[PDB]
Amino acid sequence: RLTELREDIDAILEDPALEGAVSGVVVVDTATGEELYSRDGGEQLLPASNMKLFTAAAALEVLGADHSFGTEVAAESAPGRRGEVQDLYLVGRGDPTLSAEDLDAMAAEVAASGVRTVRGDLYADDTWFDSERLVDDWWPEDEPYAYSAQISALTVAHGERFDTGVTEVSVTPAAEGEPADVDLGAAEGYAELDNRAVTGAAGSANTLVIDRPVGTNTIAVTGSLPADAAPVTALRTVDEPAALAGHLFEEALESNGVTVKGDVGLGGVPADWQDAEVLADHTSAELSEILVPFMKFSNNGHAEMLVKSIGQETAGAGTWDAGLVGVEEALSGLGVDTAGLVLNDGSGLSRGNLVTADTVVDLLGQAGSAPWAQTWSASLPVAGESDPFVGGTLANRMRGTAAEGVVEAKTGTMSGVSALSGYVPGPEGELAFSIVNNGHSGPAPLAVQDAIAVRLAEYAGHQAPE
């Protein structure tokens, strides 16, 4: 059976879509340790979001599956009989899932604790991590997009996917000839609007563009939206996620009948403060639960927040330098051979990252007998599953194949880089595989990857659901 599986993967990898590409492909029976297939297994390749595999494992080792994150509100002393504080501080400690509703509930606590007036200023404190918002070699042109959100200790997560540091922009058509209506979402009165967008004739071509030009906090909307068109909604990032958090907290406070009389900006708790009075707090869910939106949808911001959180835990330093070493050391402590690894970030956005397919599989084996193996496993996309929180980035891949419902695997695509790595359980042993593609010249070789995963599922003794 093994001899023929090698022939089959050989033929699959002979696909025209892999022209000029290097492909690291490694397959291991995780019970025996038997290497079933290996090709360029020790070759160093960009992993794209397969890099999140290393990050997730290290966060579970360093922080633990029980770990949660806090946000709190702090005045120098409690409110008076008059119900007055001076300056107020919103303080974030790396919560990657902090919502607008979470800010409202803390605003309700500030009120219920007897504040009616903030006489001084409101500060957003994100000093728990450094203020290095983006990695060195990330591309400025990617910066308006949610996957390239700025990294902060204090960031507002949008929606049930928990997309951090962004706002939802909605563009609605009006009468033909009238400007389109732009709704900045949460960033209303925070980000600036530059609306050059017109409403086009009914049935005209849609040419609408929503940008944030580099080094500005301005949403620039150009082009035409047809009068008959459906509204356009787009997640766009903001400059200084903490400042937007501070902004939304200001409104949250005011909405809960707390008057803020001064300004909103960045600032850390003075330390001059003998014993700061905590007027509100919030605790995230635990890391094991947070791992699901993180890994299923491949959240870049979560990953980089987890790295800085690892840096804080191992070193007291919310820093890429500190957190990345912490990743490496945790993986080493896990029994992983990190020789072939180059860690430049936690998400895999960086083109400075290198893995090898042998390293990936090594980790997949080591993660399988870790105490946290089940929380880790549950976080991965499941091939062909309809439910977005189950199937994730694999929800519309491998449906009606032997892989559907069985293959748990992490994805990762950029220009010239694609990857699929994970597990294949079955009647004939549980397998770990890594498929890493670099240097191909068109569309990501996703069908080739599906083909391999599918064959392995068949080999593991599975059949397509009908």
Among residues 232, 234, 231, 264, which one has the least CA distance to residue 249? Answer: 264
What is the Cα–Cα distance from 56 to 64, expressed in whole angstroms? 10
Residue 410 annotated as binding? yes
Q: Per the residue annotation, which of 148, 224, 298, 418 is the catalytic one?
A: 298
Q: Which residue is nearest to Co ion (CB)?
A: 462
The answer to the question of residue 238 lying near Co ion (CB under 5 A) is no
Active site (annotated) includes residue 52: yes
- Number of helices (H), then strands (E), in the chain: 11, 25
Three-state DSSP class for residue 332: helix
**Residues 134-153 interacting with Co ion (rule: CB under 5 A):** none
Residue 132 or 194 with smaller CB distance to Co ion: 194
The answer to the question of residue 455 lying near Co ion (CB under 5 A) is no
Residue 22 or 464 with smaller CB distance to Co ion: 464
Residue 67 or 399 with smaller CB distance to Co ion: 399
The answer to the question of residue 462 lying near Co ion (CB under 5 A) is yes
Residue 236 or 462 with smaller CB distance to Co ion: 462
Query: Least distance to Co ion from the beta carbon of 456, Å?
Result: 11
Residue 146 or 406 with smaller CB distance to Co ion: 406
Taking the alpha carbons at both ends of the chain, their separation in whole angstroms is: 25
Q: Per the residue annotation, which of 23, 49, 284, 288 is the catalytic one?
A: 49
Q: Of 2-10, 29-37, 171-179, 405-413, which part binds Co ion (CB under 5 A)?
A: 405-413
User: What is the largest distance, in Å, between two alpha-carbon atoms of the chain?
Assistant: 82
Query: Least distance to Co ion from the beta carbon of 33, Å?
Result: 24
Q: Of 1-9, 43-51, 199-207, 404-412, which part binds Co ion (CB under 5 A)?
A: 404-412
Active site (annotated) includes residue 170: no
What is the Cα–Cα distance from 110 to 208, expressed in whole angstroms? 42
Residue 349 or 460 with smaller CB distance to Co ion: 460
Active site (annotated) includes residue 296: no
Query: Least distance to Co ion from the beta carbon of 375, Å?
Result: 23
Query: Least distance to Co ion from the beta carbon of 461, Å?
Result: 8
The answer to the question of residue 302 lying near Co ion (CB under 5 A) is no
Query: Least distance to Co ion from the beta carbon of 426, Å?
Result: 7
The answer to the question of residue 406 lying near Co ion (CB under 5 A) is yes
What is the Cα–Cα distance from 381 to 362, expressed in whole angstroms? 20
The sign of the torsion formed by the CA atoms of 353, 284, 271, 75 equals positive
The answer to the question of residue 254 lying near Co ion (CB under 5 A) is no
The answer to the question of residue 19 lying near Co ion (CB under 5 A) is no
Query: Least distance to Co ion from the beta carbon of 74, Å?
Result: 22
What is the Cα–Cα distance from 24 to 323, expressed in whole angstroms? 27
Q: Which residue has the tokens 């090709």?
A: 39
Query: Least distance to Co ion from the beta carbon of 271, Å?
Result: 30
Question: Using the rule CB under 5 A, which residue among 10, 142, 188, 387 binds Co ion?
Answer: 188
CA 264 → CA 89, 133, 242, 422, distances in Å?
10, 20, 11, 46
Q: Of 123-131, 271-279, 392-400, 458-466, which part binds Co ion (CB under 5 A)?
A: 458-466
The answer to the question of residue 189 lying near Co ion (CB under 5 A) is yes
What is the Cα–Cα distance from 173 to 224, expressed in whole angstroms? 9
The answer to the question of residue 270 lying near Co ion (CB under 5 A) is no
Three-state DSSP class for residue 54: helix
CA 231 → CA 132, 203, 223, 228, distances in Å?
35, 14, 14, 9
The sign of the torsion formed by the CA atoms of 436, 442, 443, 447 equals negative
The answer to the question of residue 34 lying near Co ion (CB under 5 A) is no
- Measured in degrees and rounded to the nearest 5, phi and psi for residue 241 equal -45, -35
> Other CB atoms closer than 10 Å to residue 132's CB: what's the count?
16
Residue type, 169: V
Residue 320 or 459 with smaller CB distance to Co ion: 459
DSSP per-residue letters across 361-389:
HHHHHHHHTSTTHHHHHHHS-BTT-SSHH
What is the Cα–Cα distance from 221 to 212, expressed in whole angstroms? 9
The answer to the question of residue 400 lying near Co ion (CB under 5 A) is no
Active site residues: 49, 52, 298
**Residue numbering of the annotated binding site for substrate:** 410
**Residues interacting with Co ion, by CB under 5 A?**
188-189, 402, 406, 462
